[PDB]
Amino acid sequence: LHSIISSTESVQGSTSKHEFQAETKKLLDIVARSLYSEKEVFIRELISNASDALEKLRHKLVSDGQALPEMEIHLQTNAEKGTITIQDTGIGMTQEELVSNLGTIARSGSKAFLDALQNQAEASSKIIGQFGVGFYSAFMVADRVEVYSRSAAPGSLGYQWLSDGSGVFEIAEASGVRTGTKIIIHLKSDCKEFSSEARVRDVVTKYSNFVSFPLYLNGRRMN
Numbered sequence: 001l002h003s004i005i006s007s008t009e010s011v012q013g014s015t016s017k018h019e020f021q022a023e024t025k026k027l028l029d030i031v032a033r034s035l036y037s038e039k040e041v042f043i044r045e046l047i048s049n050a051s052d053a054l055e056k057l058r059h060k061l062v063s064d065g066q067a068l069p070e071m072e073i074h075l076q077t078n079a080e081k082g083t084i085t086i087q088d089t090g091i092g093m094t095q096e097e098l099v100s101n102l103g104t105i106a107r108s109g110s111k112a113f114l115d116a117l118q119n120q121a122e123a124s125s126k127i128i129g130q131f132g133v134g135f136y137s138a139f140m141v142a143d144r145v146e147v148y149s150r151s152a153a154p155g156s157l158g159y160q161w162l163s164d165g166s167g168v169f170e171i172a173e174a175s176g177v178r179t180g181t182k183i184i185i186h187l188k189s190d191c192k193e194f195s196s197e198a199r200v201r202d203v204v205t206k207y208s209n210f211v212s213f214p215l216y217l218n219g220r221r222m223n
């Protein structure tokens with residue numbers, strides 16, 4: 001087995017409170033309405049984000065003239081705790097991205113996204129992934145979401161990011177955060193299936209060969 005996910009991060013800073021941007025809640029809701037019928041697709045959306053983060057790290061390291069480190073995507077199910085967890089060893093998120101990225105689209109304009117979603121030229125899941133709101137799909141299956149991230153940028157601190165998706169999110173400095181990003185999803189009552197290894201394996205194996213970095217599920221290689 002090869003696992004990197006462990007509950008070892010520790011809160012080491014006081015909590016700063018932030019309220020959702022105006023049109024953030026509306027986008028959360030529309031992503032949920034759009035993907036309910038195939039709600040298992042949140043896993044693919046998050047794997048895609050992880051893959052993107054690893055590509056961003058690659059380009060940083062190429063310009064830095066440095067070797068590629070362990071570049072991996074990990075899934076972990078906990079049936080007892082009713083969670084699914086995804087962790088990647090990519091570029092991570094800065095403090096300002098953790099504070100601002102949730103409301104990025106709406107502020108920058110959601111019209112292009114909403115128009116594309118309406119046209120249905122591609123799968124709704126692809127449109128959502130492409131316009132950079134795949135993280136929104138975490139909330140549609142979650143009672144609450146727990147993020148740990150630390151950017152590869154020099155001087156970046158590690159952070160814990162918490163939200164129930166209701167209108168507020170909380171950020172605190174954390175120790176023991178590995179460069180990259182871990183998302184812990186505490187699953188909704190109708191979404192418990194995704195805390196089952198068998199179920200998640202059945203979902204992921206349908207596209208795991210399309211993932212360009214080593215993909216692990218509960219310590220087992222999927223590709």
Ligand SMILES: COc1cc(C(F)(F)F)ccc1Cn1ncc2c(Cl)nc(N)nc21
Nearest residue numbers: 049050053091092093097098101102135181
């Ligand atoms: C936790 O991923 C996110 C959190 C938030 C926020 F709301 F917590 F800020 C907004 C957007 C995203 C998606 N996202 N953005 C950068 C990024 C990187 Cl570097 N890695 C991964 N795996 N996902 C990413």
